[PDB]
Amino acid sequence: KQVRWCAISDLEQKKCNDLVGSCNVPDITLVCVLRSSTEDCMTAIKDGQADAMFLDSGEVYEASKDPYNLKPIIAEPYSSNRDLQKCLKERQQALAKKMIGHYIPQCDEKGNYQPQQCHGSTGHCWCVNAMGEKISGTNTPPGQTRATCERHELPKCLKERQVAFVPQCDEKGNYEPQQFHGSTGYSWCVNAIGEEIAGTKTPPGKIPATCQKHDLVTTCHYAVAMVKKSSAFQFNQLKGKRSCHSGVSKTDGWKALVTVLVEKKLLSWDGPAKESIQRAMSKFFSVSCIPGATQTNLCKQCKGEEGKNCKNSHDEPYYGNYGAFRCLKEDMGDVAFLRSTALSDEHSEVYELLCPDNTRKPLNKYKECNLGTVPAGTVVTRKISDKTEDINNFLMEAQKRQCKLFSSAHGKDLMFDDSTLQLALLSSEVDAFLYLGVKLFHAMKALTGDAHLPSKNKVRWCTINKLEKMKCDDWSAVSGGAIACTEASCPKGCVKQILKGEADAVKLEVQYMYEALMCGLLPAVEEYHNKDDFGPCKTPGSPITDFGTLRAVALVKKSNKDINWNNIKGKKSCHTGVGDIAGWVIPVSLIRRQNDNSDIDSFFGESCAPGSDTKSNLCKLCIGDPKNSAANTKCSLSDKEAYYGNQGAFRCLVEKGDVAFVPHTVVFENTDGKNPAVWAKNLKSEDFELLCLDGSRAPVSNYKSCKLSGIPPPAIVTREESISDVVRIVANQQSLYGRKGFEKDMFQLFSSNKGNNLLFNDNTQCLITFDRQPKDIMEDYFGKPYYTTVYGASRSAMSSELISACTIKHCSNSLEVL
């Protein structure tokens, strides 16, 4: 019902009052809280005196910590080569605007851009490639012959696959990051457009380089150094010069420049633990105006009034990009460090750029004469997110109602970057780390001084609950400084901690694996479950007969002789639950692979898949709670189902089913006398059969050959610089607290008085160092069958915030490169 925005200057508050008066959003009132600087506004938000504010990307990492503890919530979205049905989304967003006479993208039947796009109110038309970009030169006014529009929707990867080394592309048609030559056995990594990145080519037999995912994006902004053409100094002569900066905490004003100076060996400084950055910089420049700085000489050139001088605020006239430009123009500085948004051609007469290659270039080449790419700013609120909903509602309704958000007659870049086109809500999961990405986050961390000092003799294990934490603390007490503990909420959070340099290793089930391997983490060791062969564990290296991995299988009655694999469409199927690998994942994957219509809600009839829609066919014959008429619990992902799990899905094949999808063990777990005492009394393991791929059958004890696929074992993961460490520290720790370890009376790695299946599954036999075969990482852990069947042998089969954070954003002028 009310949203308080924090303004850092008088001009920002004037724009805020303007928007209070003009922008009428129903049921949400706007309020302007005035503070004197950026930091004061952050504090006011932390104190609940205000609700949200805009921040530069560089100010984000320090905002997520004490004494602010803020999180990003609303950012500007970038166009990329990963967007799907972009025309439909853009058309919807345009139709949602409360205005008339604006361009509403025209879509065809299939959700693709019409090659010709017209602006209705003006009569202008133009041509457009698949991603909506205007083909240069095709804008035609009314009354003039329209440019004939071709259909530019063939991607470059598919255009290269034809006329043919044959690359591998994904379902949409982009480049797979890992490329493998079929003629000459080799492996390398490629760009977002197919360019081979140097230093990655690998002859066969050798392990291949770990390739990283690339997204091609447009409209990137950069940090630049600007100098008047009359001056004659270069980059490595900055020492002693007078500088103008946008702000002490901005990326375009401070942080990128510092990273460059350090890499260029120009800044006399070693580490942030013994001397702050501002000291070294104050000794580097003579006099400067760097808003927010605490060194006297770094504020001499500023022109703010008494008390307003050198603040992170427009009250300081030299604050911001345009403030630094004004500082350079009035000759209060020799070089201005700012963003490529303040660039204009009206300035290309007097001003030029100053490249880190000790050369000068005109403004228009800012793409090749810069200090780094600068991500867009973000709206931030309290990490507790008590007001995210209201802020998002107000901002998006103001965008629909065409309020003057990203412009003002009072000044430039007030409240928001004036270069902002549209603001969109981020996932609630996104914090500073997920927003900045792994690389940029680690860079911010190393710059602020929180860089962790790696220990090659201590592994920090991550726990997912308090019971795991208690077992970890027992292990750490009996460990002798080799095992430490960290706390997280879910395995995904542990992977985040590992990538943030706050933890070292963690055991992941296969379901969490695809993301982990996608972010550069490798398997150090794996969980052995073969209850019958302790050979490979007592002498580390003795060959492995079988790993004890689960085998997903389809189990049927010998009574129903007609059910074969090539006719499973329509039969009552049985699933352990929506999410389980053997009970749900493998079958639906193989189905959408072999039957191209790929509809599983209609493929089966009256299946029991606990976890699907209560009204669909996937929740019939699901007897929910036999003796509980006080609650309807049918089709639930809990034991309140009489069909959840291996046992519950086995009840289905004997009751009202024709086929079940379970691990192979279930048949031997509830038959042949070793069964509970209700429904599987006189049932034997001979009365059942398995379904194989070629459409035949076999006895149950053929799960090695008549199998759907193989389930990869749970794996302990860590970073590549810790493998050789973690492995050995595991080995040392396994000869002491394993099953046949020396001090098994002190502690067991595979049992606990605090709970069951903590840290590792209780039926685990031992841990084995993951051998790194010379092939793809996913193909090595998952195995070619599982990989190809579930993920389609692709690195684009999944999209989450974490993979988006492990992504290199390849900047380009446009996606027209096809």
Give a short overview.
Helix content is 25%, strand content 15%. The chain is α+β, with helices and mostly antiparallel strands and 818 residues long. The protein folds into four domains: 2-79 and 376-443, Periplasmic binding protein-like II (D-Maltodextrin-Binding Protein, domain 2, 3-Layer(aba) Sandwich); 222-373, D-Maltodextrin-Binding Protein, domain 2, CATH 3.40.190.10; 459-547 and 713-780, Periplasmic binding protein-like II (D-Maltodextrin-Binding Protein, domain 2); 551-710, Periplasmic binding protein-like II (D-Maltodextrin-Binding Protein, domain 2).
CATH architecture of the largest domain: 3-Layer(aba) Sandwich
Integer tally of domains = 4
Question: Number of helix segments?
Answer: 23
Structural class: alpha+beta
Radius of gyration, taken over Cα atoms and rounded to an integer in Å: 31 Å
Can you tell me the CATH superfamily of the largest domain? Answer: Periplasmic binding protein-like II
Judging from the principal axes of the Cα atoms, what is the shape? globular
* Biggest sheet character: 7 strands, mixed
Number of strands: 31
Percent in strands = 15-25%
CATH class of the largest domain: Alpha Beta
Q: Fraction of residues in helices?
A: 10-25%
Report how far the terminal alpha carbons are from each other. Answer: 46 Å
CATH topology of the largest domain: D-Maltodextrin-Binding Protein, domain 2
GO biological process, one term: iron ion transport
Subcellular location: Secreted
Pfam family, one: Thyroglobulin_1
Disulfide bonds: 6-41, 16-32, 87-107, 118-125, 127-149, 157-169, 189-211, 244-327, 289-302, 299-310, 355-369, 462-494, 472-485, 519-806, 537-766, 574-652, 608-622, 619-635, 692-706
